[PDB]
């Protein structure tokens, strides 16, 4: 997996991308790595923001599915034509698979002006694939067609770099032990948070609130998104812990920027065993992101908890699809100081962990 190390690139707040080839002869494209969606979709028209795009006319192995797909977001939209072609990852496993590809023909607020990627690789499950679950996601196709193990891992380092290890784990990318949390349901990478601590102090909330209406691991989101009831209780604790300096209310809501005082955030995740949990701890260096001007990278959510780049950059994260579990370990590349470091600790005794999940 040595060749897969350092295969991710990107710009701060614009996501992480991997190099991929599509078609015959191979057309090179940079593709956003997204564990929060399930579609493989690439720019296929000369949009002004794009360095390059998928040209189906040049591909002898392209097959038309004669179906369209419309994907609206809360903050964006893309529309495309469905098809299949041969897909390879140059700095991944030495294999070529026939995968579903949505040729993006129309979009709004999807591509980023100034970014170096022109497509999205949805690494989540078929349940949330569009138009429906019959459209097989890329990784499902990869595992079925080859001998690549049903597992991938991500090391996102805080312009930016990282590693996507496809089909395995690179032990040099983390320190200590991996700790696993069960994937509750195979749609998003859904997990269960059982306890939240700010500087070691428990928020004293019903743990069902932490997962309302879900908690997910998402490489395609920058921020740590929390449910509003959890967010206001979390922010109130951060305000009290950072009472040394005063900050405007707009800063905490992400409406304005600010130019040891900040507390650590610990998330206890459901363990592999009954009544067993473990905790992951992040630093200010993770949730206070440079834009010196800093943006408070914790926001309220209506879709539930989203463990975005804020969480993931502190850890080496293993998406063990084969065993329906997600592993966390201290990242060997995470940003810290001499006083505090990111941590993965366990085991802990936590009762009624099944009550924390929303139904």
Ligand X SMILES: Cc1noc(C)c1[C@@H]1C[C@@H](c2cc(-c3cncnc3)c(F)cc2F)N[C@@H](N)S1
Active-site positions read: 34, 218
Burial (CB count within 10 angstroms: exposed 0-12, middle 13-18, buried 19+), residue 79:
middle
Residue 159, Cβ neighbours under 10 Å: how many?
10
CA 179, CA 317: separation in Å to the nearest integer?
10
Residue 73 found at the interface with ligand X (CB under 6 A): yes
Given phi > 0 = left and psi -120 to 50 = alpha, else beta, which region is 287? alpha
Question: Least distance from C-beta 334 to ligand X, angstroms?
Answer: 19
Instruction: Report the residue from 14, 24, 61, 116 that binds ligand X according to the rule CB under 6 A.
Output: 14
**Using the rule CB under 6 A, which residue among 45, 65, 95, 112 binds ligand X?**
112
Candidate residues 1, 17, 30, 36; the one interacting with ligand X per rule CB under 6 A: 36
Interacting span for ligand X (CB under 6 A) from 8-16, 253-261, 317-325, 348-356: 8-16
Q: Is 220 in the site for ligand X (CB under 6 A)?
A: yes
User: Residues 146, 158: contact at Cβ < 8 Å?
Assistant: no
Q: Does 211 bind ligand X (CB under 6 A)?
A: no
Span near ligand X by CB under 6 A; candidates 54-62, 217-225, 261-269, 317-325: 217-225
Which residues are CB-neighbours of 259 under 8 A, at least 6 positions away?
292, 293, 294
Which member of 8, 42, 99, 120 binds ligand X (CB under 6 A)?
A: 120
188: contact with ligand X by CB under 6 A: no
Size of the site for ligand X (CB under 6 A): 18
Biggest CA pair distance of the chain: 65
CB 29 within 8 A of CB 22: yes
Residue 76 found at the interface with ligand X (CB under 6 A): yes
CB of 165 to ligand X, least distance (A): 20
Please report whether residue 113 would count as binding ligand X according to CB under 6 A: no
Q: Which of 20, 22, 34, 44 binds ligand X (CB under 6 A)?
A: 34
Contact between 74 and ligand X per CB under 6 A: yes
Per rule CB under 6 A, is residue 75 in the interface with ligand X?
yes
Of the candidate spans 58-66, 205-213, 219-227, 350-358, the one that interacts with ligand X by CB under 6 A turns out to be 219-227
Q: How many CA atoms lie within 13 A of 260 on its CB side?
A: 3
Element (H, E) at 140: helix 138-145
Candidates 190, 218, 313, 320; binder of ligand X (CB under 6 A) is 218
Are the C-beta atoms of residues 335 and 282 closer than 8 Å to each other?
Answer: no
DSSP 301-314: ESS-EEE-HHHHTT
Q: CA angle at residue 353 from 349 to 355, to 5 degrees?
A: 150
Give dist(CA 286, CA 334) in Å, integer: 9
Binding status of residue 198 toward ligand X by CB under 6 A:
no
Binding site residues, ligand X, CB under 6 A: 13-15, 32, 34, 36-37, 73-76, 110, 112, 120, 218, 220-222
């Amino acid at each position: 997996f040595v060749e897969m190390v350092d295969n991710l690139r990107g710009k701060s707040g614009q996501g992480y991308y991997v190099e991929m080839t599509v078609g015959s002869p191979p057309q090179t494209l940079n593709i956003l790595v997204d564990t929060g969606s399930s579609n493989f979709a690439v720019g296929a028209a000369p949009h002004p923001f794009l360095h390059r795009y998928y040209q189906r006319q040049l591909s002898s192995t392209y097959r038309d599915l004669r179906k369209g797909v419309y994907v609206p977001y809360t903050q964006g939209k893309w529309e495309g034509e469905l098809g299949t072609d041969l897909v390879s990852i140059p700095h991944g496993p030495n294999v070529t698979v026939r995968a579903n590809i949505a040729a993006i023909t129309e979009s709004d607020k999807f591509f980023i002006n100034g970014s170096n990627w022109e497509g999205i690789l949805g690494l989540a499950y078929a349940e949330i694939a569009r138009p429906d679950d019959s459209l097989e996601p890329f990784f499902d196709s990869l595992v079925k067609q080859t001998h690549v193990p049903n597992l991938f891992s991500l090391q996102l380092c805080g312009s930016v770099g990282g590693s996507m290890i496809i089909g395995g784990i690179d032990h040099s990318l983390y320190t200590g032990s991996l700790w696993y949390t069960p994937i509750r349901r195979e749609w998003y990478y859904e997990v269960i948070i059982v306890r939240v601590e700010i500087n070691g102090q428990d928020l004293k909330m019903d743990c069902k609130e932490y997962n309302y209406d879900k908690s997910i691991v998402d490489s395609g989101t920058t921020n740590l998104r929390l449910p509003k009831k959890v967010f206001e209780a979390a922010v109130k604790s951060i305000k009290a812990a950072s009472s040394t300096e005063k900050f405007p209310d707009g800063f905490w809501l992400g409406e304005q920027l600010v130019c040891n005082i900040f507390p650590v955030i610990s998330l206890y995740l459901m363990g592999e065993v009954t009544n067993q949990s473990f905790r992951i701890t992040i630093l200010p260096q993770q949730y206070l992101r440079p834009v010196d001007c800093y943006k408070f990278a914790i926001s309220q959510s209506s879709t539930g908890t989203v463990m975005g780049a804020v969480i993931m950059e502190g850890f080496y994260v293993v998406f063990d699809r084969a065993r329906k579990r997600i592993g966390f370990a201290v990242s060997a590349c995470h940003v810290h100081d001499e006083f505090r470091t990111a941590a993965v600790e366990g085991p802990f005794v936590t009762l009624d962990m099944e009550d924390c999940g929303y139904n």
